[PDB]
Ligand binder design. Structure first.
Ligand SMILES: Nc1ncnc2c1ncn2[C@@H]1O[C@H](COP(=O)(O)OP(=O)(O)O)[C@@H](O)[C@H]1O
Ligand SMILES: [Mg+2]
Lengths: 49, 464, 592, 51, 593, 226
């Protein structure tokens, strides 16, 4: 339930950078999933037509 | 008959030391002390007439560093008068303590008389001889399935209740006290509140009164308003009373030490008042020993029919096992009952997460003689399948519900019907251990006979 | 008497101080700087002076007050503005004619020049008197009339002489009590050590609620007179609205607002807004300041003052509780107080415990919160006051993992949870219903069964509706919204209506300035009845879109349930709510 | 296009869930533990300096 | 006899005590509390007493024994329980008639009333005798027969008189040595200072394995007879149960179970269960307790006595090694010993070093773990004993970064690390197969080649399977199981089978309480053969899902091999395993066809 | 601050103290504290840094009888570009706003490199009003902040879901972000932009949006100024 990181100030900064990047990637990928799902709904409607 | 009376009929004058060298924090230092003891509880008289008790902690030549439980506040060099009793802190105990409510330091707040002492016992106590101990092998049917089947409390067990701040640990502890009883045949509860809220103390007192336990319960209430230094001695006083009533009276005793987190916070405050080692998270390096002198007063002894079961109620700060209070208490005590905020938020009562919970004294005190043959295998299999359920729930959250296998789906169903129907209980519902095991066998019969790999083949054939 | 021996920053060592007590305030220096005694080593007595210590030379006399840090309890505490040390800011400004606080200014904490009307109590000469007994009454304000004069809790004995009715300045003798020697002479005031809680005969259970007026606060997360709550108190979260409401629209007969380390312009804002308040307790509008005592305490004040601000406030609240008045204390910037305590501990050199906070922070917080609660006041006559502590945590660093925030959340039974995002979304009072909670519902069930029996189940069902709507919103974000069933659509619509009308209360608006408990109960009844009617219509098989089209009138009536004015009150609003319930049932049934 | 888009959407949603439920909690727990250990080292240094 | 100047916690600075050496045993107080001198600041001499300091007054006399803390070695201890300063708890209970240990009770460490049948050794009158030479033997009990009486080290000379065969107490003279014209009288017992390790002729490389009985400990991370061991883990991980099972079922001839900072109910459980258990060694069923002695120091006992208990236990183990017996000392918690050291250092006022633990903690641990090792005893006749140290380090907070854990891992050779995620969900033993290691596999290759040749290759295959499946488990937790290949599915399934059946060993069931070396080897053979057969069948082209559906019976038979009773004997069970493998091969061939 | 107190309060003039390198001031506090036997606090700085910074900062503010004010621009220097540092933490506690200078903006040659997303003035509503500044100030600032956040989101979104798939409210927002960073934030070091000229530039930036899109602006101000 954690990462085997040696406690250090540099390691703390690296892990904060990792958390910020992961949050940014999570928001970006959630928005991309929403956009792709809108495109997918359009695609399936065109499939029915 | 009893020769302890003869030494009682002796009067010992006490030296009143007006010589107070100095005072700092909670520590008041005396000078010109004539042969100071190491734990002589003194009676320090304030200039205003208030009398606060204190015990010396370090005694250099002609010097004694007294810490006062009520606090130094108001102590003046010129007017304070400190008398040395010449003996360590001794609680006046008797069989009449049962049914009386005491303060943090043992002074009766039940509006009744001072306890008519039958003996004066040191609160610090003594270690029980390991050769004189008896391994607790008598199961207690607490009535709650999560503690009786998954875990198991013996009679001499000292299993605490790990919980967070807002969890219903108090309601669980009161449920255990009102339902505790030997599986194969009463408990004189000794309750020690340390820094609890008035609401918590009132709840415990009202529960005991309404369940009738107040006729056999001796409360040692140390509220949050009470001084923070006598939280150190409140569990000592209650445990000395319990040790008396158990070993020297042959009464089975439930010792409920509420807010051991508050006790340890008082311990850290006392340590930080001195130049003590910071241990981990600021708690003293001797914390383990202190908590040992608290917890290890439980257990049964050879030749004496009494027993003491300690159910300390911890308050983990951030619901973290790794915190020093839960870690040290788990290292010392003989198990733990892990109250889970996740299950409490889910709405389950009792909110016991059985995975972090454990009981050393299940090994013996469950089996073919104490209860039915299948209990140990059933508990092991239930633990395994509950963990598989939690892991499969995490996998479902990560990768959707379709990717799960048949085993994962079965394990999710088991998890749902185990938390919903087995762990969950009413506040006043008591289940016999056999009924709990039958519900457990229903939950295992969710599975096919092949997947119950922790069940022995004979038990599985005879019980499936 | 005493004399200075060593000055190294705030810490001062004074020699020739034999007989000086611990934590006792001493007048350090020729300017009579106030400081307490930290430790004693023989003659010496380490003193942490409160004000700036520059200029104190060796040989400066150190007069010993003889008493610990004490609150100046008496008449004239009500509409004054104080600091942590309880120094009158208005009187200091008037006396010094300067915008600054002169160093070592010793103006009396209560106005001595003002004359108070004193009416002797039931006690007469020769009658026994005990601590907390009311031996007189003083007319202080219009909101707070008959400011009951209390014998000091420690004092007791036989009354020797009691002053007759008339006008008497706070500093002159009012009562003489002989207890093994008539050494007691009592004025209109007494000094009580700040750290020592004022004793009570018995501390009852907090049963009656604290009706703050805000619908969400007094419906879903209620607080009790004598209960302790918590508030995030961050910038732009409605903390001002919550404080204003609790100050002027609550049940409290008195208000103690402490700042304990707030920012300068924030203090300017609160001390400029509170005198502009008006509470309609009587027919004529009168200021809320007539019943609200301020402990104004910015960051330039001594760290000792900032650490003692909440203690002084709770002692004032305890005093007004001992008079039988329900008191509400708003402890803004509790964390600021914790930071001041940490700074004091660092000055001591005491070992840090968690995130640098001292070892005894949790114990001090628990004791301070336990000092709050309903209690029957000491001595005769029998009267039961209560102190409510509403401490805005204002976490340091914007995180709830701080030791002080964790301790406050654990100890306080109610968390009201102002939401920064919801406040930014133009919502008031911006209460995050997902994280806010109240543990006083179990004890309020008695009052609710006594007055409004269905209110607990109504609020529980409203919370269930809101939680189900959150789950349905998550589902509608995950997949298509139209895939949701008719019941889910009704849940979403009714919960959106509840958020818009029931939860969003406009303080500025006249109709929603203070919704009484009866009107809140009636609105809960109306909303729950609308939800039940919609659920019954769905169970009947009617399309939800058609049902909404037909019952738009009932929905408009439910929305206007906000717009019903509590000015008429009593049966007029209740009767109109009874009529609204009849219309809702009829229109819903007609659509079927 | 439908099949490819559905596969890509499934992969992206799986990775979003994996991030939010593993990477964010694991990194947050590591941050908390590292901060606690740094505070422990600071406390040990403080006690040594006090001695 | 000096006075007392200060009593702060467990340390007692004693004034007017010029002439007391470092680590000299003293009797502090009127109750004669046993203590050891730490510092000597002129006249004063700081003392760490091994009893409770409550009631000590300034001025109370302190006597200087003139001796270091000395354990008492000889017949008697084998089947007893002690108290760190080596006070027999049974004798204390009988003498005090109370369930508490009296403060400053001075009961002899070894019972003097018992008469031991002494048979003189090969040394006769006039023959030169050196330190550690065996001049006789006594019958301690049924299991420890011929408890060889060793002449104390650092003592030499010519035997002037040796007692004949008969029954003697410990006080009676047994042998007399003349050295440089000075006569020395030797008895059945002799005291040895615990701090100084007992001398040996030459320490040897350990080559025989210490059969713990646990499957994972025996196979994956083996330990030798004479090798140090460490078992870190949080509370509830299983270090205590692992230690108790090792003491019960090890092949070591003598067990020194040391309890430091361990709850007293564990000592009571040992004292109750060990007599019921029986050892198949010595040709007859003899109780385990006849070869196990306990050095019990409960957590609530005096803080300073934990170090004394460690040293007493290791010195008893060294004595039984010098007798030629393969001993295995078991410290309950070297971490609790280290916590006691930290408490003493903080009471003294020393520099905290790391986490408050004194700066010499690493050196003390290194010395204590270097006490262990296979060695030839000091004197004739030639014999080769050993001392294994299986010490359960208990880290604070469950983090293996604790100073005591790091120093213990630096000094030890075997790491049986415990995972709490496996401690929960009842997966004992909770040995974390990833971090755990054992550096004794290279030296045990000889034993494996001698007895079970395929043991190292099967063990390496199991380690590879577990590591590969751990990587695949990370991959599947990240991106699901759809991407994994067939062989990946077999690897994951077989490793889950291994963890559920082979590694997971219930120490309190009849079948898996003690899995012997041959049963563990057969089970590795079965599981590895199952993995190989599944891999071969899938490489032949069979779909893994259908193969699993067809061979569920074989998988259940493999998983149920842990239920085979070791009591049935090696011949009977090995036949059952051979039949299981044959039927497994037939079933896999039929499924493939 | 003593000079500021004198001028503002005994002379009735507005001051605007501009302190520089309060990180250097805190380093000087560290040096002074360790000159005594004071044990270092959380990050070496004294435990009373909160008190010292509180005094220095709260020396300012308006007063009642005097028609003068003191404003402060402490200007910190964040050591490791973090707010968790004690100097930024305490400065944020005492002070009443934040203005953030960004390395990302500085590396693009944008002067002043101030990013308006982390920067805020808690007392903005009082300063930006109708009698003060111009009556559109608050709504214009809120709209600029909202559209700048949308611009950053769209800039991150373009490299994920292509430029074409962005909505109109994302493409126009990207254009607004480019014009905002390169013309509004980018200010000549010696270019004096009054508040009215800056607001006119802000309206020029906002005018690329049709009036329907500007939603945070009040309808009346939108109809009058657009
Ligand atoms: N090999 C095993 N078989 C069955 N149960 C075990 C085994 N090892 C440990 N346990 C269980 O773990 C529990 C905790 O004991 P243990 O973890 O050994 O104490 P400690 O916390 O000192 O390590 C015991 O109740 C025991 O039932
Ligand atoms: Mg253990």
């Amino acid at each position: 339930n954690r990462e085997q990181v040696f406690p250090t100030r540099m390691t703390l900064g690296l892990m904060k950078t990792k958390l910020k990047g992961a949050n940014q990637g999570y928001s970006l990928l959630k928005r991309k999933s929403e956009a792709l799902t809108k495109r997918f709904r359009d695609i399936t409607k065109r499939i029915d037509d | 008959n009893k020769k302890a009376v003869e030494q009682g009929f002796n009067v010992k004058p006490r030296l009143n030391y007006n010589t107070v060298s100095g005072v700092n924090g909670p520590l008041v230092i005396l000078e010109k002390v004539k042969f100071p003891r190491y734990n002589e509880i003194v009676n320090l008289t304030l200039p205003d007439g208030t009398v606060r008790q204190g015990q010396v902690l370090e005694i250099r030549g002609d010097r004694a560093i007294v810490q006062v439980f009520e606090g130094t506040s108001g102590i003046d060099v010129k007017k304070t008068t400190v008398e040395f009793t010449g003996e360590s802190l001794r609680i006046p105990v008797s069989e009449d303590m049962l049914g009386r409510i005491f303060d943090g330091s043992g002074r009766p707040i039940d509006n009744g008389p001072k306890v008519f002492a039958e003996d004066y016992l040191d609160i610090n106590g003594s270690p029980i001889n390991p050769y004189a101990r008896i391994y607790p092998e008598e199961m207690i049917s607490t009535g709650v399935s999560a503690i009786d089947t998954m875990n198991s409390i013996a009679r001499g067990q000292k299993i605490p209740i790990f919980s967070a701040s807002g969890l219903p640990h108090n309601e669980i502890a009161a449920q255990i006290c009102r339902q505790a009883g030997l599986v194969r045949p009463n408990f004189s509860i000794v309750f020690a509140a340390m820094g609890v809220n008035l609401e918590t103390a009132r709840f415990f007192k009202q529960d005991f009164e309404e369940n009738g336990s107040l006729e056999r319960t001796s409360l040692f209430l140390n509220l949050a308003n009470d001084p923070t230094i006598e939280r150190i001695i409140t569990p000592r006083l209650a445990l000395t009373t319990a040790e008396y009533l158990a070993y020297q009276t042959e009464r089975h005793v439930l010792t409920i030490l509420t807010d051991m987190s508050s006790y340890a916070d008082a311990l850290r405050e006392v340590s930080a008042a001195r130049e003590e080692v910071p241990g981990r998270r600021g708690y003293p390096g001797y914390m383990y020993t202190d908590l040992s002198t608290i917890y290890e007063r439980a257990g049964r002894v050879e030749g004496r029919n009494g027993s003491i079961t300690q159910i300390p109620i911890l308050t983990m700060p951030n619901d973290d096992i790794t915190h020093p209070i839960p870690d040290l208490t788990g290292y010392i005590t003989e198990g733990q009952i892990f109250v889970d905020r996740q299950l409490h938020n889910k709405g389950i009562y009792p909110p016991i997460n059985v995975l972090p919970s454990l009981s050393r004294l299940m090994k013996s005190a469950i089996g073919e003689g104490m209860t039915r043959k299948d209990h140990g295998d059933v508990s092991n299999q239930l633990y395994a399948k509950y963990a598989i359920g939690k892991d499969a729930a995490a996998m479902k959250a990560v990768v959707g519900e379709e990717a799960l296998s048949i085993e994962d789906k079965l394990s999710l169903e088991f998890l749902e019907k185990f938390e919903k129907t087995f762990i969950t209980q009413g506040a006043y519902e008591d289940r016999t251990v056999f009924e709990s095991l039958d519900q457990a066998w229903s939950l295992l019969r969710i599975y096919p006979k092949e997947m119950l790999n922790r069940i022995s083949p004979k038990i599985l054939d005879e019980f499936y | 008497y005493g004399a200075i021996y060593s000055v190294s920053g705030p810490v001062v060592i004074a020699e020739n101080m034999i007989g000086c007590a611990m934590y006792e305030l001493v007048k350090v220096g020729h300017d009579n700087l106030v400081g307490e005694v930290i430790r004693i080593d023989g003659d010496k007595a380490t003193i942490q002076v409160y004000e700036e210590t520059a200029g104190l030379t060796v040989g400066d006399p150190v007069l010993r007050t003889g008493k610990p840090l004490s609150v100046e309890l008496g008449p004239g505490l009500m509409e004054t503005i104080y600091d942590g040390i309880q120094r009158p800011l208005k009187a200091i400004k008037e006396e010094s004619q300067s915008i600054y606080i002169p160093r070592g200014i010793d103006t009396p904490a209560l106005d001595r020049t003002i004359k108070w009307q004193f009416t002797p109590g039931k006690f007469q000469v020769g009658d026994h008197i005990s601590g907390g007994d009311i031996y007189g009454s003083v007319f202080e304000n219009s909101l707070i009339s008959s400011h009951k004069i209390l014998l000091p809790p420690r004092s007791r004995g036989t009354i020797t002489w009691i002053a007759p009715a008339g006008e008497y300045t706070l500093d002159e003798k009012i009562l003489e009590v002989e207890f093994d020697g008539k050494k007691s002479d009592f004025t209109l005031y007494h000094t009580w050590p700040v750290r020592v809680p004022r004793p009570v005969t018995e501390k009852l259970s907090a049963d009656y609620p604290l009706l703050t007026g805000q619908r969400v606060l007094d419906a879903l997360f209620p607080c009790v007179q004598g209960g302790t709550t918590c508030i995030p108190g961050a910038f732009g979260c409605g903390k001002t609205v919550i404080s204003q409401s609790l100050s002027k629209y609550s049940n409290s007969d008195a208000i103690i607002y402490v700042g304990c380390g707030e920012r300068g312009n924030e203090m300017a804002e609160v001390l400029m807004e509170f005198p502009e308040l008006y509470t309609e307790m009587s027919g004529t509008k009168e200021p809320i300041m007539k019943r609200t005592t301020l402990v104004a305490n910015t960051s330039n004040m001594p760290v000792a003052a900032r650490e003692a601000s909440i203690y002084t406030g709770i002692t004032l609240a305890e005093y007004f509780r001992d008079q039988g008045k329900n008191v509400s204390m708003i402890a803004d910037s509790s964390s600021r107080w914790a930071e001041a305590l940490r700074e004091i501990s660092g000055r001591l050199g005491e070992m840090p415990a968690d995130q640098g906070f001292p070892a005894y922070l949790g114990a001090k917080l628990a004791s301070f919160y336990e000092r709050a609660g309903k209690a029957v006041a000491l001595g005769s006559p029998d009267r039961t006051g209560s102190v409510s502590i509403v401490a805005a945590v204002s976490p340091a660093g914007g995180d709830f993992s701080d030791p002080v925030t964790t301790a406050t959340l654990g100890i306080t039974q109610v968390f009201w949870g102002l939401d920064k995002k919801l406040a930014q979304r133009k919502h008031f009072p911006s209460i995050n219903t997902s994280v806010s909670y109240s543990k006083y519902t179990n004890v309020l069930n008695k009052f609710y069964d006594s007055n409004y029996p269905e209110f607990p189940v109504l609020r529980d069902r409203m919370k269930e509706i809101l939680s189900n709507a959150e789950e349905l919103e998550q589902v509608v974000q995950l997949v298509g919204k139209s895939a949701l069933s008719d019941s889910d659509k009704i849940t979403l619509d009714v919960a959106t209506l509840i958020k818009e009308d029931f939860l969003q209360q406009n303080g500025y608006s006249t109709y929603d300035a203070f919704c009484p408990i009866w009107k809140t109960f009636d609105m809960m009844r109306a909303f729950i009845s609308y939800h039940d009617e919609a659920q019954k219509a769905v169970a009947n098989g009617a399309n939800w879109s058609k049902l909404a089209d037909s019952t738009g009138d009932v929905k408009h009536a439910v929305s206007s349930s906000k717009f019903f004015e509590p000015s008429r009150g009593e049966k007029e609003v209740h009767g109109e709510f009874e009529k609204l319930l009849s219309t809702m049932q009829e229109r819903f049934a007609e659509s079927t | 296009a439908f099949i490819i888009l559905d596969e890509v959407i499934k992969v992206t949603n799986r990775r979003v869930n994996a991030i939010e439920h593993v990477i964010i909690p694991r990194t947050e727990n590591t941050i908390a533990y590292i901060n606690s250990e740094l505070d422990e080292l600071d406390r040990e240094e403080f006690y040594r300096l006090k001695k």
